[model samples]
Target: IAAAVVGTAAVGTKAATDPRSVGTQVDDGTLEVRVNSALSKDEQIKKEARINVTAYQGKVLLVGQSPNAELSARAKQIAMGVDGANEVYNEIRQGQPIGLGEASNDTWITTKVRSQLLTSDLVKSSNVKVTTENGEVFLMGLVTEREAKAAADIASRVSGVKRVTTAFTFIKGGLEHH
Candidate 1:
């Protein structure tokens, strides 16, 4: 299957592929850009912080590093300020951002999680967004509780992963939203 961002899938086809409503998915993409742009406008954040944004069903996930609390806190505020984002998760840890050489390990861990999910029959890999930072894996998507547990387990089992956190919009399992 093709990666999430690049593909030839039309709206109808794409909607069929993922469990989320197309409108929510569109909000995910739009939120990413808006949040990123908002962060870029912050001179302090751009220079001193590293924030990677992921949007799912109007929820925003920010993962990366900032040396100080001020920068990290500001990044979360900017992310929360963006329209269409109903929830914001700030997973950005405190410390220096991983340098270029150490970043390969994080990328590799993310790749392993994605590939493992792809091979598993229980997961609809298309719906699971896998992201890694400093060996911690952040899993988000619209899926059943079964899928979330399986994906979370899969990510935790991967070597080099320090932790696994999930933010899933449980489909029909109740408490999908408060």
Candidate 2:
């Protein structure tokens, strides 16, 4: 508070694509790693199932397919136990993972959604992380409600996207982050 006052006025651009502070970004990344690290102890899940973990702030989204409900439940527990994970979304389904052909389509659809978000004026994106599992697209981000709506709208229109799901931490505005 003493000498820092003058330093506040002389600013460097860290850029503002993301509303989350740098520390929060670091924590978010670390949390994803921790969750995946925990899951790695179980070799059965990795071989018999396809599970993916994604984090925005402390909110975590677990996507992909599992061989059974047992595997999905285990994955959810693993994700929940990770420190700093505020919310655990278990979107895992009981099914075989898509094959190479369908997997490539999902990848293309994800890229299409990303480019659409990048070009759309309605959404502030790239803060928006896009994940695809079995032709379904999952979006996670810290964004405003308006941005969320536009993002989902754009994703839903992408060809080969089976469905669109969002796990957004909506900004309430004025920086009073809840």
Candidate 3:
């Protein structure tokens, strides 16, 4: 199953036209790693607190649930303190930890929506990072206005998605192939 999905991403025509420049894409991935490492090193955050971290164009999106208010705040601080994290959106809830069932469902929803986006002509899946908490889907990427709206619309149509939130940095035009 994983191999099939990986194959499809490479087979698509738009695969050659991802929105972010190569340097930005590499930096975004590095920023995500730094934030993840920072969160893991923090003693205040519990292992049960499921956190999803995504970085795009130096902006970081933190999703999922934290154990308490203090932990949630601390997680946000840690993300913001990362050297390359330009902006941090803290959407983590401060209540009960996310159950395994819900987490699995979130993963399924993310995969389904992402697959659809990859196949759609209106959007480029490589430019978007899809994360789900509970039933709400969060999208982070650098794209054009049309692509952002198209992604949100496609995500909203997915089976289990309750809502779609976009934190996109739009360029003047759509994706360019170089």
Best by lDDT: 1
Kindly report which residue stretches of model 2 are placed more than 4 angstroms away from their true locations once superposed. 1-26, 95-140, 143-146, 149-167, 170-178
Pairs that collide, model 2: none
lDDT of 3 by residue, 1-178 (tens): 3565444435544547655454323377887887787677776675657577877767777777876767767766875563656677777656643787768878798877777777767566656667788767788877777777777777767666667687766866735686
How far in Å is the alpha carbon of 21 misplaced in model 3?
24
lDDT tens string, model 1, 1-178? 6568865656663334554444433377888888788788788898988788878777777777787888878877865563667878776667555776447877787777777777767567667667676666777778877787778777767666667677766767665465
Error of 1 at 102 (Å): 24
Ranking of predictions according to lDDT: 1, 2, 3
Of the pair 1 and 2, which is ahead by lDDT? 1
**Which regions of candidate 1 fall more than 4 Å away from where they truly are?**
1-26, 95-139, 142-149, 152-166, 169-178
For candidate 3, the TM-score is 0.47
TM-score of each: 0.48, 0.47, 0.47
Best-to-worst ranking by TM-score: 1, 2, 3
Task: List per-prediction Cα lDDT, in the order shown.
Answer: 0.73, 0.71, 0.70
Using alpha carbons, what is the TM-score of model 2? 0.47
lDDT of 1 at 81: 65
Cα distance off (Å), candidate 2, residue 25:
13
